[PDB]
Amino acid sequence: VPTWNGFSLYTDETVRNAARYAYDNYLGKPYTGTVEATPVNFGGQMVYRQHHGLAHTLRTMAYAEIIVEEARKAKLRGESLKTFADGRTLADVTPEELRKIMIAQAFFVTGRDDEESSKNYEKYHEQSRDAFLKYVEENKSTLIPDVFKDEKDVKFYADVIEDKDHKWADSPAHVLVNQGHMVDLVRVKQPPESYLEYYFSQLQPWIGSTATEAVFATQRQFFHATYEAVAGFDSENKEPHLVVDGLGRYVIGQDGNPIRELKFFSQKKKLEENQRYMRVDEYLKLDEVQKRFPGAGKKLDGGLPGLKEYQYLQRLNSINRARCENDVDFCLGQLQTAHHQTKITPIKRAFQSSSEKARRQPNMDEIAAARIVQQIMANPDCIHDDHVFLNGQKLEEKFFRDLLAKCDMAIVGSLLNDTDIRNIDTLMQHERNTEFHSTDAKAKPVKLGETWEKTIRSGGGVTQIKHDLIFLMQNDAWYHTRVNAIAQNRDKDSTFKEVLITALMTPLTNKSLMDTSRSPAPKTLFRGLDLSEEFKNKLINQAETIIANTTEHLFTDLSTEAFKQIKLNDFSQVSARTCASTSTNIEVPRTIFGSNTIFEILDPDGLLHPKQVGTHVSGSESEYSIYLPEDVALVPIKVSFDGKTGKGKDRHIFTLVAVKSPDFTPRHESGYAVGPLLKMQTPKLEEIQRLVEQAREEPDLERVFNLQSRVARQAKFSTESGYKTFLNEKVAPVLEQSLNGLLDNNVTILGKVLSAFPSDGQWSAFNSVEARQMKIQMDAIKQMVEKKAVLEGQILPALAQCQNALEKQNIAGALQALRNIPSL
């Protein structure tokens, strides 16, 4: 299966002009014959050939297109398709071949002089051929050799139009022109079930059942798009079956069984006693019919859903009906929109839908990640060469790579504020000389914060900061190549600072984009990539597998296989995890940057939330930024070869549709950000650490001995009588008792030597120089004894009682231990 080149009925100029020449010279002119010569009027506009005119002709061309499309898919799915004499298959039809096919289809019915279908088929197809050859000769110059290799090529398609011998299976040309003509015959002729089965059965061998279901499902949408009535389908309808070939009927005998040789009967032939015509319900339920037609048990509604018959019938009479019959460009536009929609509806069918177009609310880790970002921005002092150290916690390269891979950094950015944006410069001044390295190795390293201050930042308020940041991202390749490579986890030999900066700037850049972007979101965006040959080939294969397993259906929903193949082959991650640059102008990626890979990103449901980047004057890059939501997939619907780039590499355009579904949500293990954040909230509790260090000081018994010796010298020698009685009675026992109390760590002794300390007035009885000095010595020893008695006897037990209440979760008891403290 070769890669298509983007050739399409709705964009090829040659095929459209052939449709014009057919309309202007035949299809749009009045019939010269008898049958159905009289025109019919639709909303005031006249249609001369309502049945075999422009809308019918263009639909047959559109059928041939999707028949080739569906045949290529069936071949890629592994199905066996009907072979021609030379072993080819409808899947083997090339773009140039099909362009010749459709041009002949434009003239297949122009030779009609009226609507007679009972004769002069020979004559009318002769006039059709003459019309086609007349067009070819008149535009000989353009047609040859570009469209037709020569006049011998022209005669082959003139031969298919003439149809001398009804060799309807001879080549892809005969098949597609015949089948395209026959597919338009499925209409509201009753019973509709008989007609659909017959034409389904005629196409089915060439492309298979899955493909044939897609063709006739699409045919109904083309009928709606061109304002033709669409019939219903009832598998248990009770009308007599209609043998379409020969307009006959089949029979059920008086005996039980359907009669066969299965045997044809004319509608005229009279039947024996109480024999009967086979009903359509019985026809569909026959085993041979069920084996080739999946219509059994199935019902389809006629008309348009959500329209009741009086509104549907006014639609069928709309002037757009005649515009389809008289305006080539209008009718092709209706078909193109219907063709495009049938590439999207099977995708949405296969996934759980959602009514929310916005990003989800933050999870716990995105909330914690945002808090960590704000604290780093607030304290760039925390940035080292290996790690970040903040609030006693070490965050290394792995932590920031986890944030990039598990957090929605756009959601994180929505939890940041203008203070974090203002702090961008203080982070940059801290990183004045931090060198960034472009992924291009020949580029010279660039100092981050210094470049920022002297080339990017223009002062102003926080909005100007946001545009400066957005500008650095759009303008400086040394910056965004490293950032995007790290963000998408495909970088080589990156420094830790480069990882951290990427982790900090990705949410901050998203906030800048979100706050600044004014324009409503474009619905078509183009992204350029430079992929290796091997990697592009992998994406082509994956896209083709997805496209081949995405099909419209009539009766057999294969949505489960589309789900399975899209999950196996999705390459949405190529556009995820970073602020991805896109342009509304395909020539920015195609022509200016020369990408060999172009993603045509369609977002008809507004799920991508693109943000404007920079200016959009004429000649600008028309840039928009996408940070892919976690539950949006960019599902491929078309892969086209687009020619070669300036360097001679192949260029391919992938058309992708953004689809949102809970089925695309990743499952991450939580905790990677909350854990570290919890560590940082840990209190230092420095005062309590100093309470214990002070509760572990050895008492200074040096000074108590000093005063004991000082008392002893004054207590051997004192001529004053009363001073020596007081020193030996009231002072020396307190000092000896205090010494043993400090030595023994005995609370009982300490709490009671306090009462024994003499008063200031008892000391004031003696106005000696040494007695005053001792009084000051005694007070210091007294404070030292009291502090220990209060610590070990009052405060330390209360903490223990408080703590023990807390390990029993007796909270009010823990308070009580502090409140209710007993005296000594």
């Binding site: 100007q464 545009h467 759009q474 020539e587 200016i592 020369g594 920079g614 600008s620 300036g646």
Partner: protein
Amino acid sequence: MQIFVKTLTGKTITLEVEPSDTIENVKAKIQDKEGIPPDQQALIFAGKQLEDGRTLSDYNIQKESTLHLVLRLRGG
């Protein structure tokens, strides 16, 4: 030596230059013929942005080569 820098608006601007010429060199020249001021100009050659200071010889640019010019402005 002569090169031409192409734009998104369609015009093709020819410049008479010589390899020892830096990039600022070039923009300056586009400003006089087209008077598009230098600090709105971003020059692309073979998909790679060309930076101030480094010369026309450094980026391999040569006779009758093609450069691409986009206007790149800050928002707001």
